[PDB]
Write a protein that binds this ligand. Structure first.
Ligand SMILES: Nc1ncnc2c1ncn2[C@@H]1O[C@@H]2COP(=O)(O)O[C@H]2[C@H]1O
Ligand SMILES: Nc1ncnc2c1ncn2[C@@H]1O[C@@H]2COP(=O)(O)O[C@H]2[C@H]1O
Ligand SMILES: [Au+]
Ligand SMILES: [Au+]
Ligand SMILES: [Au+]
Ligand SMILES: [Au+]
Ligand SMILES: [Au+]
Ligand SMILES: [Cl-]
Ligand SMILES: [Cl-]
Lengths: 197, 188
């Protein structure tokens, strides 16, 4: 946020991506920074045999495509909802870093917060089994944007095949963790919407 | 400069998770290990930092220390106050620190995918194949020889010394390894 956006996105190159649309492909070598005005994206990487895997989500006020500003695209960035995003060239960012140093702290603050979540992501895969990881992943998507409050808990918009690429198992084997958790009295599975108690 | 200079011996902890001392560190010479604990006190190694690397910098933009930092060898490290670094911001030093942070996501995010979809047996499977990177690996006529303990492997794969020990039992009769005392030979 802050007042750095007015100086940064002064030369708007606003783009609108529909849901499911890919914005960044891994391996590309184009020097472009993105800022999310409204919407949410999905960050995807590959495992060891070339399957895609969800790492996290970025929301409004988030930058992405910024790891090349310092000395190839490291991940896929896909729009999960309708995203309003603006481009800034790496060249424009380099000049405005000299007109103000708070844009590198704004960018560094998001880079540091992504390290924390991703480092927590490494440990949650080592010290948790699949049942516990679908339990945490549900627990993490509440303290995450786009969940309204429910009388008995929270509502989240996620499919089981999305959870399988977050926790590292198949959607069918995840069918239980949602099934077994639903009959214990923690969760609701319905179409595109889950209720966590 | 000066002042800053402190020397940590091998195995010595430099940063504890949960601490709030708002201080930046720079490695003059040596290398550290970044470790996290599970919620009942089991270790896992996240990575290593070497000469020219900063650490203790994630609060520099805001909090609780995010990981344990342990000295792998005798390390010489320098303080930087968050104020001194912020005052010295004035200007290429913010690009230098961000370049180290950008490489830390890539390596750590790449580590997530290699750890996901793997069970404890599978992490010991490559970690033994990964054990070529350790500076204590000898050549074997039929493969590689390394001197490593179960509690050292337990901090790489994130599981107990007993579970790493049985998994190696199953692997020795399957055909990767032969265990002799404190040294195992991995075939192929
Ligand atoms: N672990 C992660 N957490 C959050 N965002 C990421 C992560 N890894 C990559 N990204 C984003 O995905 C982008 C892909 O291209 P870049 O490397 O240019 O910049 C990257 C970041 O914006
Ligand atoms: N995944 C990681 N990779 C590399 N370094 C890390 C990682 N997680 C934490 N650190 C470093 O360890 C430090 C511990 O304290 P801070 O959170 O202040 O800043 C942290 C980073 O400098
Ligand atoms: Au704009
Ligand atoms: Au599985
Ligand atoms: Au001092
Ligand atoms: Au300190
Ligand atoms: Au374990
Ligand atoms: Cl809540
Ligand atoms: Cl599995």
């Amino acid at each position: 946020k802050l007042k750095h956006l007015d100086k940064l996105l002064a030369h708007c190159h606003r783009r609108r991506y529909t849901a499911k649309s890919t914005i960044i492909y891994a391996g590309d070598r184009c020097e472009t920074l993105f800022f999310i005005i409204k919407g949410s994206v999905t960050i995807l990487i590959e495992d060891d045999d070339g399957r895609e895997m969800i790492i996290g989500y970025l929301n409004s006020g988030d930058f992405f495509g910024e790891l090349g500003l310092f000395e190839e695209r490291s991940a896929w960035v896909r729009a999960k909802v309708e995203c309003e995003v603006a481009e800034i060239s790496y060249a424009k960012f380099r000049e405005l870093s000299q007109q103000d140093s708070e844009i590198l702290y704004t960018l560094g603050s998001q880079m540091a917060d992504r390290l924390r979540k991703t480092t927590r992501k490494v440990g949650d895969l080592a010290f948790l089994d699949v049942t516990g990881r679908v339990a945490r992943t549900l627990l993490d998507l509440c303290q995450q944007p786009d969940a309204m409050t429910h009388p008995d808990g929270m509502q989240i918009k996620i499919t089981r095949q999305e959870i399988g690429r977050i926790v590292g198992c198949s959607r069918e084997m995840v069918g239980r963790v949602l099934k077994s958790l639903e009959e214990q009295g923690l969760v609701h599975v319905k179409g595109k919407t889950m209720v966590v108690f």
